[PDB]
Amino acid sequence: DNSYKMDYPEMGLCIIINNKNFHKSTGMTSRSGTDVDAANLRETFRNLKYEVRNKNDLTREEIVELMRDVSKEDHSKRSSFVCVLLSHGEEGIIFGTNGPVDLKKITNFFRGDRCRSLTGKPKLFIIQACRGTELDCGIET
Amino acid sequence: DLGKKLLEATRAGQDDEVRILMANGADVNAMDDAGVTPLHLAAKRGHLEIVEVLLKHGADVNASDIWGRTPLHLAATVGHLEIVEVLLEYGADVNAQDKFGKTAFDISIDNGNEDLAEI
Amino acid sequence: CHKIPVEADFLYAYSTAPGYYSWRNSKDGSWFIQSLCAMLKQYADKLEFMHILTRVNRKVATEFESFSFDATFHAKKQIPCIVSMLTKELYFYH
């Protein structure tokens, strides 16, 4: 078949990691407006019947621990998985409050052989974060 | 939007308009979407007395734009000694780095501001 | 026995192309998340997910431009970046 099976009892988890304030030591700025994103995402996804869990201001260790635990939950009754990351970034990197987390480390928990209740199911990572500091000047069209 | 007007009056060097907007409750830490603050603008454009009245009313001396540039970086780039002096007095971080890994000190070397390299 | 790749069935919906800053507004939030939620609200009952994300790309690319009091940061643009390792179409109404 051409389409993912979406008529499992539950649409799935929508995990939102909303990092707004960062340790002084890291020198990272307060992310004004991230709360507007977080609320907008919760409304949108709960309306799609996702089970929305919202997490605010996690350290790098807390993000990894969160993702490990979630990947070890029973997703057998869930059609999909959504994870939204709202933070500072660099290429390949999302920031916890105290420092950088490797995106590949986060997502590896949900690999087909490591999270077996999500094997064959769509795993959606939505990443609102910088991928560097390049600016696109655009072109007239 | 008092915040926007303030950023605008600051860029324009309008010390009186700056003062009136502040008396009216304008956020001295207003920001555009790139993290540019009134202090960044005043420091870059050489508006010494605006720099002083912003710092007096709680402008964040160490605010950085999306390229990690602080007011100290910008004052350093144009070589405004008095503004650099005032920022340092308000506890500007000489050891804060921008995107290119460059310090306010490092800029003083690049632009050859012999006189800037000590404070 | 049939296998699929362990890396299959992931989608990474980035707000921005590799290398690039991702723009946000203090009041309305990030350009990408605003556009993503608006496109999901309008189209989740009408379009396959990749087609939803393509409208998101068009919305971010055409409806937003940075405003800054510093010319270095002014009039900048953004395209999001859809990275799909999905093996099937995704419809929310199914």
Tell the CATH topology of A1-141.
Rossmann fold (3.40.50)
Run of H or E residues at A96: strand A93-96
Considering only CA atoms, which of A54, A59, A140, A72 is closest in space to residue A110? Answer: A72
Residue A83 is among the residues annotated as catalytic for this protein: no
Considering only CA atoms, which of A96, A85, A84 is closest in space to residue A45? Answer: A84
Number of domains in chain B: 1
Determine contact: B66 vs chain A, CB below 8 A: yes
Experimental method: X-ray
In order, the DSSP letters of C46-82 are TS-HHHHHHHHHHHHHHH-----SSGGGTT-B---EE
Determine contact: A47 vs chain B, CB below 8 A: no
How far apart (Å, rounded) are the C-alpha atoms in residues B96 and B87? Answer: 13
How far apart (Å, rounded) are the C-alpha atoms in residues A66 and A71? Answer: 9
Determine contact: C65 vs chain A, CB below 8 A: yes
Rg over alpha carbons for chain C, rounded to the nearest Å, is: 16
Max distance between CA atoms of chain A, in angstroms, equals 52
Task: Determine contact, residues C32/A128, Cβ cutoff 8 Å.
Answer: yes
CATH classification of the domain holding B19: 1.25.40.20
B chain contacts of residue C26, beta-carbon cutoff 8 Å: 31, 33
Determine contact: A32 vs chain B, CB below 8 A: yes
How far apart (Å, rounded) are the C-alpha atoms in residues B106 and B73? Answer: 9
In order, the DSSP letters of B50-79 are HHHHHHHTT--TT---TT---HHHHHHHHT
How far apart (Å, rounded) are the C-alpha atoms in residues C90 and C79? Answer: 22
Catalytic: which of A14, A75, A83, A88? A88
Cβ separation of A133 and C8 shorter than 8 Å? Answer: no
Kindly list the distances between the CA atom of residue C15 and the CA atoms of A85, A88, C36, in Å, as whole numbers in the listed order: 10, 12, 9
Considering only CA atoms, which of A13, A124, A86 is closest in space to residue C11? Answer: A124
Q: Which residues contact A84 (CB under 8 A, 6 or more apart)?
A: A14, A15, A16, A17, A41, A125, A126, A127, A128
Question: In chain C, which residue's Cα lies nearest the Cα of A30?
Answer: C26
The structural domains of chain A, with segments of one domain joined by +, span 1-141
- Residue B110's domain spans which residues? 1-119
Domains of chain C: 1-94 (3.30.70.1470)
Cβ separation of A134 and C40 shorter than 8 Å? Answer: no
How far apart (Å, rounded) are the C-alpha atoms in residues A92 and C37? Answer: 24
Instruction: Decide: helix, strand or coil at residue C84.
Output: strand
HSE on the CB side for A41, CA within 13 Å? Answer: 31
How far apart (Å, rounded) are the C-alpha atoms in residues C88 and C10? Answer: 11
Resolution to 1 decimal place, in Å:
2.1
Q: What angle do CA C33, A19, B95 make, to 5 degrees?
A: 120
